[PDB]
Amino acid sequence: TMIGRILLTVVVIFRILIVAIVGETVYDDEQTMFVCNTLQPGCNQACYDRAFPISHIRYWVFQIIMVCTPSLCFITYSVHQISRFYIIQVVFRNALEIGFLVGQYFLYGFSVPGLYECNRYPCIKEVECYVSRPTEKTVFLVFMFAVSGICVVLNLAELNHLG
Amino acid sequence: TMIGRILLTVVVIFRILIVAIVGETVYDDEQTMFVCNTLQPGCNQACYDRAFPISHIRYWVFQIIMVCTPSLCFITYSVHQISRFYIIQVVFRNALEIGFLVGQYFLYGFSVPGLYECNRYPCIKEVECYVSRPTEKTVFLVFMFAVSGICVVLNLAELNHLG
Amino acid sequence: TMIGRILLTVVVIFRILIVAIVGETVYDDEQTMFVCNTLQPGCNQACYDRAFPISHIRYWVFQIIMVCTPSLCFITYSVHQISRFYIIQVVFRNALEIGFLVGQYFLYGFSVPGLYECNRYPCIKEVECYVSRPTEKTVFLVFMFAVSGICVVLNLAELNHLG
Amino acid sequence: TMIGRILLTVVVIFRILIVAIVGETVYDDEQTMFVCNTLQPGCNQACYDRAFPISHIRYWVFQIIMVCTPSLCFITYSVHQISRFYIIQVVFRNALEIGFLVGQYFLYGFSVPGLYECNRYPCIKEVECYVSRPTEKTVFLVFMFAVSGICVVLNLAELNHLG
Amino acid sequence: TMIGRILLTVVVIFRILIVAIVGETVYDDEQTMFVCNTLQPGCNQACYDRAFPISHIRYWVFQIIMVCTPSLCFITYSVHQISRFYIIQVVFRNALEIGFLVGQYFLYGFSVPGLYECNRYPCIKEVECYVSRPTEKTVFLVFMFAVSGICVVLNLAELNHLG
Amino acid sequence: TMIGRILLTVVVIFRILIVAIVGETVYDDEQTMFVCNTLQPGCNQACYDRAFPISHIRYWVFQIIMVCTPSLCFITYSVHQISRFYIIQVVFRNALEIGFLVGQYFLYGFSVPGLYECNRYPCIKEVECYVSRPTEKTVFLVFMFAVSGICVVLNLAELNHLG
Amino acid sequence: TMIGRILLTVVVIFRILIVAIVGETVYDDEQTMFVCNTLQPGCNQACYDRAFPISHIRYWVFQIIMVCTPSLCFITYSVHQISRFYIIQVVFRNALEIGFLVGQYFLYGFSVPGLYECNRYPCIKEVECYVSRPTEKTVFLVFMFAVSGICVVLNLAELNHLG
Amino acid sequence: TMIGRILLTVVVIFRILIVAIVGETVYDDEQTMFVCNTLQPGCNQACYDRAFPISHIRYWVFQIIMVCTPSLCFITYSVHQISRFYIIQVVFRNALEIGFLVGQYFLYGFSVPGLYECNRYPCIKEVECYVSRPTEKTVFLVFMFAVSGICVVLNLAELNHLG
Amino acid sequence: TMIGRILLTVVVIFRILIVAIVGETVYDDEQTMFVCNTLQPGCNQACYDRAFPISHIRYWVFQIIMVCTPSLCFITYSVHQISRFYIIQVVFRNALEIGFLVGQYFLYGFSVPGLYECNRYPCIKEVECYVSRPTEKTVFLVFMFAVSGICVVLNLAELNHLG
Amino acid sequence: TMIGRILLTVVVIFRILIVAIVGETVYDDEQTMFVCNTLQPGCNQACYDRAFPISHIRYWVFQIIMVCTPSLCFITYSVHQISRFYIIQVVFRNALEIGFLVGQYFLYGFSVPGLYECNRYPCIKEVECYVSRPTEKTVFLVFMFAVSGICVVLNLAELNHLG
Amino acid sequence: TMIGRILLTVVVIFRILIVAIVGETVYDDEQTMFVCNTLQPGCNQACYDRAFPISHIRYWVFQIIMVCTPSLCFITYSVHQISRFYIIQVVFRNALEIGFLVGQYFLYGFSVPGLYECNRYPCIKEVECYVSRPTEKTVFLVFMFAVSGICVVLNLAELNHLG
Amino acid sequence: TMIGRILLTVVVIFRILIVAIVGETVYDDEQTMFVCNTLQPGCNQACYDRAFPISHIRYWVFQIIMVCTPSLCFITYSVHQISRFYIIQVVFRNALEIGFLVGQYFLYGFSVPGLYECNRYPCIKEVECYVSRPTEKTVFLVFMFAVSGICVVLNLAELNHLG
């Protein structure tokens, strides 16, 4: 139960670094290079909005920030100043990380396809649109799912270790 | 009344982080991707100005800065150097946060629609225009309203605790 | 006369923060989204230059920097090292802030209109041009005038307090 | 065996500096200046995605971050607090760097050509496309391969020195 | 001779701040908004290059950096460790600042006109071109000349004070 | 032999500052404002690549970083902890700086012309292309050559002083 | 009753000549120079079709041909070969010319306006369109109405003369 | 049975004149003003070809020429030179005119709609296209059907008169 | 009085030939090459219509046809079949030709200028437009006025000869 | 053998009329509406030239003119003025018409496809192009083949009748 | 003096045929393919009008018509009905043809250059423009001058023959 | 010598018909579909003028008209009214037709290539241009040469027959 802590800390820092340094620049051109075969004004806007409601990078930043709140609470408490608080914050972290992983699976799945079929007003009937960087975005998706799985496993390990 | 303080501090820091890190980049393309069905020069400018008089991110930055002024005053006083000042600053913070929440509701409501109908000069009669990222902007609106509600509840809690 | 100092310091810091964080990005697209109804090359340049000779944000940065010079002089003097210097620097600050407020009123007034009428070479006769974000720019103008008025009042207060 | 350590540290810092300061700006225009001889919408997207699945700079940042994890683990352990850990981390670093060099060779090779032949839907039959900055990108490839080879040699040196 | 030093330091810091914070963004669009009445490829490039050989902001940054070298030399000497060095560095600073002011006058003069007449290959005969932001650039020119004049006067003051 | 050290340090810092602050922004538009008289797709890419294989700013950053490696080695050695190392590092620095100056002369020469003649596929026969900011780039070239010459002279001075 | 015949023949020939020689070339550009303020494909087609269902020149050619049929019948009869036929053909000509004049008034009126307001699918709401050569077309309308009135009067004259 | 001949001759000449003088110029812009909402090359060609396989004016010219062949045969026979030939040619004319009227009904129907829905390669799925002058073309269709009906009735009249 | 008749006939035939052979092709591009400096849709149409209400060639064809009607009347009378008719038709021809010459002078004057100033809706304020072939059109105007003057003189000659 | 002559004359006149009146206007837009999916200048020209070397209408006019030469020769002979000439001209006409029918089959076949695949310089590899009015052109081809077959049969009939 | 008449008649008919059949189609694209290097609206119109005030074909048609008037006068006289009239008409024809040849030389000269230099408002300073078909137009000029010279010689021959 | 006359007349009429009916419409788009790979204004004009100085159809019309002049002279002579004139006109016709055939060979040769290489001002160095309908134009060239050869042979036949 000694190394588990060390590896959890290392995984957390690794995830933060990967998200902070490179992820902001794969998605930079997401809408400027999204294009549809049509002459109707506003169809690109409607179809992009329907294909990508919340961007991956926004979801990941939110998750990263929200999984660090129990630690901040514990730190503020101790600064004003314990084991019951430790138990409760561990429970809360476990719950939050399982919820976020499940939500990721339900929102995005495991792949980003290259074509999208759209039927939203003002587009006439169904139109075909084309995505930017699908392979790189799929690789990023899979990597993030793997890291979050590792973190879930480790936190369950420690929860069951204490009992 | 002990945990309330800790959670108020955590909510404040969380709100600042969310606004500072991601909000500047959802709104970056607000006017460059706003488009209207027309051939008249200046109609896009007039209709964008009428649809979005003050941007959300500007309003939120202003609110965040203004709700931290009583603390700065108290700090400057103590550095020159109390309970009466504490009472007064708590009262002022309560008033300011209720005012800002009410103003948010009256300025923006609870949703951002995808279409807008415009009848401002130099546009001839009424024209139809199309918005960028309405779903993401609606999600952001709802999240910010929820956070500000939490803060209002907590500050009223402490006000009534002291009495 | 005790609280006046504290509120002057708070107003100064508030003004600096508002100018530094948001003002650089309302004006970013000032000339790229300025457009005139014409086919003559160079008319957009001439009409933009005649409508907006010095930008608001440039004027405000200059004013903010210039109203902090007496403090720097006093600090450098004391570091080399007094009441006469205090008197003189208070007088100078008062004069500078009244001059800057008067100049603001004479340069810009109280509103930014949406249309502008231009008759400068190489434009043939008179042409009509269209401005970006007039409502937001008007709001910013009014807010800055109010803050500077508050500062003027406080400094006159202290000047007359000492006498 | 004394100088080997010093030169390994110098090589690592040199590599980090070269990657961090200049590499982000050779690749900035990679897709905006990629062009194909065609009139079909979406062909540029499909052909760019097939020619460049993962960008060099992304691969190099990932490798740089991943080769520094054993040191972070050792530091965290000692802070909580050894020779067995030293042995294991040396072994792991050796393995990781050999794996990354082999993967680089298998993904990219030793050159970036100026022409690319594409046959992916929606492109009709085979089309010809043109790359940006091939000579500079080839120079960067060769330099990075050389540096990583040096690092591999040094780490094997020390592994065999201890035995 | 006491206040002269203080005001010289204040003028130097003021000049550095003005150059560093705002000057980089008046000149940002210098070539993208330069336009000529012609259909010949390469004429805009040739005429811009002939009208503006070295940009003002480049000249000012170079001057600012070069007028601070004697101080760095004196500091490095004292750290290794005097009045003779003080004399020599004062002389050198005086000479450098007079040279730079004279060069500014000879390179640029006192105004930036709105029209420019060009006769360089590949332009056929003489063509007319149009400049961006001439009034703002003229204001900046005059302000910088005034500041440099103040600095020259003060340094001559101190030189003649010591003798 | 005392002042030589001081001036070498000052020259090195001056060179680093000049390269770091301004050079990144003269070359920013190098390819976006490069244009050729042709209707063939891909000719601009091929001709730009043949005219400018490695950019000046990349070469200068690499040289600056590489001429500081012996100092880092000496520092790391002393931290683990000498005159023999001093001798060797002086020799190495001399050699590296002479090599880099010779390479600069052989790669670029002393001027940047305004026209370039290109005959690379897919361009049909020979075409004429036009360069951005040739005068400013020539000035930068000459300045950098002068500085590097000064540094070479000083290092040879000290090498021969010790002997 | 003698001159009436002569003038009827002269009016008929005059009308035929005017229609045949010039009318085909006022209307030649009717749809190519019809333009609407819109970006919607197909709106110009729908609005032109609704504004001008049958062109004037088509209506006039049809009328001219149809008012000459009784004469052809009488000629064919006499060639095969009477007063009863004369009576009947006079009656028929009278009826046909009164019908055609009434239909002209009910289809077109007395003027062609320069603006037209359109609300047909696929146009969004109401749009404004602009007509070619309205003054010339109005002059032609009035002239043709006058000529047809003269012819009606003369034929009624002769009908009542015989009785 | 006397007038029937005269009216048949008059109807034939009237039909020829109407077709020859005006019909060539309603259809002149049939394909140049046919437009579809799409960005795919070749879709306009495929959809126009599927909507209008043989033009009305071509069909009518062919019919007019083919219904005059028996007369030419009879004339050539008599010039070389009968009642049996008269009978046979009357029979043939009757048959030909009934066949042509039936074919007209089966090819075109009674109206020309303003919209057409197309699903032919290379068009992606179904697209919407817009027709030129539908009301005028419908009027022409109905008029021609009426005239041909009159001719059919008259020829059957004479066939049954002889028996 | 003998040659006057011959020359009148020759002048009439000459005028008809000049109008019929060349005049239809100077005016062919009248509206396609008319251009105004503006970006407003419909302004070219409104300004062309206001500058040229009835084209010269239309006016001249109408005049030529109308001055030949008395001859046709006299011919038809004589075919049915005198000096009184001769007198009356001479009087009528004189009156018609004087009326047409006066109307020409009042409609068009003696020149066609190259510039036109327009202030009709939808044009904003006053705009400048440019005419096609003004010199050729002026030459044609003057020639036609001269010919019509000759004809007027001759007809008055004969009228006064008979008395 | 009596009717054969009459029907041959009727077929010849029918063919001439069909070719002369309508065929010139199906092919009018043959090259202006021919389009290929490419960005290479000159590819449309090369591919159109390879797909349609000699146009159908040119071939048919040439054939029609050449099959009437023996008659002109016989007429000129008789005007200067026989059975031997009749025999020879019949033989020649038979041969010419069989040759022309065979050549038609070998040049064009029985259909015009909608797509064409092109691989001629300057087109890169193989490109796809799209044809105008293929169904109408196929109908015309089949009709002309049928008529020419009828003529061949009749002329062989008469040749074998005389023997 | 016998053949001179015959050759004069043949030359006249030849000239009429050459002018009537081909000259109308060399000049058809005179203004549509005239182009100037400029971005100013109206400059093409002004420069074309100044370069070509009256077109060659207009001048030649006018001359051809005017040199046939004496014959028409003589014919009309004889129809009403001599040697004195013959003399006078010969004199007049001689004078007219010499005048027209001299005017041709003074208006046009002997060549049409490919470049033209223009300095008319609204063109800024002097601009360069490019002509269509200069070699063909020069050939036509020379041919017409030669023919008119032949005619002048022949008419002088006959004038001096009679005396 | 009897049939030779008949065949000469038939060949002449055949040639006139072929030239008059079809040749005017192969060359109609000669310059509108001529295109060069360049961005220089005026290069298309200069290169078209250098490639095609006099068009084939112009040359052929001129030749056809000029080879019929001796017949017109003989006809005019006989109308005023011989064997000597017959001899002379035969000689002249022979000479004219041989001259025209030789000139055709020297001006045009036997083929029209698809590419042309141009080096005329204002084109920079050498450019490549592309021709319209080369195969059809080559076929026309060869056919016309063959016909003119036949005519030459026949006229020499008759010349030598008389002797």
UniProtKB/Swiss-Prot annotation, chains A, B, C, D, E, F, G, H, I, J, K, L:
One gap junction consists of a cluster of closely packed pairs of transmembrane channels, the connexons, through which materials of low MW diffuse from one cell to a neighboring cell. It is a multi-pass membrane protein. This is Gap junction delta-2 protein. One of its GO terms (molecular function) is gap junction channel activity. GO terms for biological process: cell-cell signaling; chemical synaptic transmission; neuronal action potential; visual perception. Keywords: Cell junction, Cell membrane, Gap junction, Membrane, Transmembrane, Transmembrane helix. The chain crosses the membrane at residues 1-23, 57-79, 85-107, 140-162. It comes from Homo sapiens (Human). A connexon is composed of a hexamer of connexins. The chain holds residues 20 to 276 of 321 of the full protein.
